[PDB]
Amino acid sequence: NVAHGLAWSYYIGYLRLILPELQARIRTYNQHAVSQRLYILLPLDCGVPDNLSMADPNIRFLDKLPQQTGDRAGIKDRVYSNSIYELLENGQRAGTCVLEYATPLQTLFAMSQYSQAGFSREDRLEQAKLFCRTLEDILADAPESQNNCRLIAYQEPDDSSFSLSQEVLRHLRQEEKE
Amino acid sequence: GNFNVAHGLAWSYYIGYLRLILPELQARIRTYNQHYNNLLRGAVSQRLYILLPLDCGVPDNLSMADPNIRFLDKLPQQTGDRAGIKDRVYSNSIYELLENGQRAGTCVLEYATPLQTLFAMSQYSQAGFSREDRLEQAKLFCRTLEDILADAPESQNNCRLIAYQESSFSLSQEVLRHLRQE
Numbered sequence A: 001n002v003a004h005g006l007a008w009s010y011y012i013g014y015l016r017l018i019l020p021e022l023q024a025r026i027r028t029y030n031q032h033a034v035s036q037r038l039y040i041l042l043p044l045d046c047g048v049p050d051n052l053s054m055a056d057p058n059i060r061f062l063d064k065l066p067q068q069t070g071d072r073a074g075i076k077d078r079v080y081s082n083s084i085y086e087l088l089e090n091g092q093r094a095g096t097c098v099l100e101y102a103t104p105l106q107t108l109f110a111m112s113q114y115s116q117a118g119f120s121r122e123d124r125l126e127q128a129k130l131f132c133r134t135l136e137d138i139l140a141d142a143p144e145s146q147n148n149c150r151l152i153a154y155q156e157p158d159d160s161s162f163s164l165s166q167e168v169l170r171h172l173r174q175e176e177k178e
Numbered sequence B: 001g002n003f004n005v006a007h008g009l010a011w012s013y014y015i016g017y018l019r020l021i022l023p024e025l026q027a028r029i030r031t032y033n034q035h036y037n038n039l040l041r042g043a044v045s046q047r048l049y050i051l052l053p054l055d056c057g058v059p060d061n062l063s064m065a066d067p068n069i070r071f072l073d074k075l076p077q078q079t080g081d082r083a084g085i086k087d088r089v090y091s092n093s094i095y096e097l098l099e100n101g102q103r104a105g106t107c108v109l110e111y112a113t114p115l116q117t118l119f120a121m122s123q124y125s126q127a128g129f130s131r132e133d134r135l136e137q138a139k140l141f142c143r144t145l146e147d148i149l150a151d152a153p154e155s156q157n158n159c160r161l162i163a164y165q166e167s168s169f170s171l172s173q174e175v176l177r178h179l180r181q182e
Ligand SMILES: Nc1nc2c(ncn2[C@@H]2O[C@@H]3COP(=O)(O)O[C@H]4[C@@H](O)[C@H](n5cc(-c6ccccc6)c6c(N)ncnc65)O[C@@H]4COP(=O)(O)O[C@@H]2[C@@H]3O)c(=O)[nH]1
Pocket: A009, A010, A011, A013, A014, A015, A072, A073, A075, A078, A079, A080, A081, A102, A103, A104, A107, B012, B013, B014, B015, B016, B017, B018, B085, B088, B089, B090, B091, B110, B111, B113, B114, B117
């Protein structure tokens, strides 16, 4: 139940507002190069650094997209912002895409840290998996949504085996095979 | 069941919004009044007023909800690098409350956005929630929020919840009764 409202929160409050307009934001920037899907990272351990360079230094910030505004909930001119990132291979750019973590997992982490929330670390992993499931299902019955974005769910055990940069690039190159 | 959904959303609203803005809020307001509002009976108040309509009916534009609520200006914006999003923007709007053709108050006013999700979830088949579910959920959302705020280090007389059931009714009047109470 907890993760269910979180998943609908994410779609209703954010994904259904911005995705419909994402290509126009790209085409604006691209013409005056970046892939036209939003890449959303879903780390099941819910460990989410505000800076991606923390998760892999081969992930460097490049630019912001043009902002988007909605008047919503009686707040005037609410701003939706996204960041473009380069992904490095042997010190040199290999890819470019719009990239971010799903914020609702950062909420799930903090709830596990605060006593009044009554939420164990075991609860957090199950709610994380649940969150991923629900979001995936919502995004299937909404093709106008799925076709503008790509989800990546994964799990880490300190495993020096794992490069977030390499995994994204694996997904980027595999899109180019279509 | 209807507890855990509501519970979840209340924590989300604290973690991801309230605990980040409530601390700076009074500085933001104070700056606004000193430099841009030398109206002696027309200052902005020091609390954020959060409308909690219990049917989860949330329009996007507060002005169309009631004509005695007029948009005036925005506080200076607050930004944070969040989850890989460089420069996320938290923003708040100042509204004038009109009564008997006069100005009766000025405050920072908004709906609790999470209520929009409770509505949708009771409209979409896939979510599987009734209207009665939504009403139970909205009640528990307010209760959990109150509990959270009563123990929160960021809440320091810098917040007020306004819950109401929702013709003849007037939103501004409702907000004015809370303003006057202080
Ligand atoms: N009043 C107000 N509330 C805010 C604000 N930011 C967050 N919250 C509320 O706090 C709770 C926990 O927030 P998150 O943990 O960040 O989850 C979000 C988030 O990943 C994604 N998203 C929501 C907003 C956005 C913008 C304006 C108003 C409300 C929300 C948003 C954004 N501009 N930029 C990038 N992602 C965003 O959609 C999920 C559901 O969002 P909401 O249901 O609409 O409201 C949230 C939520 O209920 C704000 O500026 N103003």
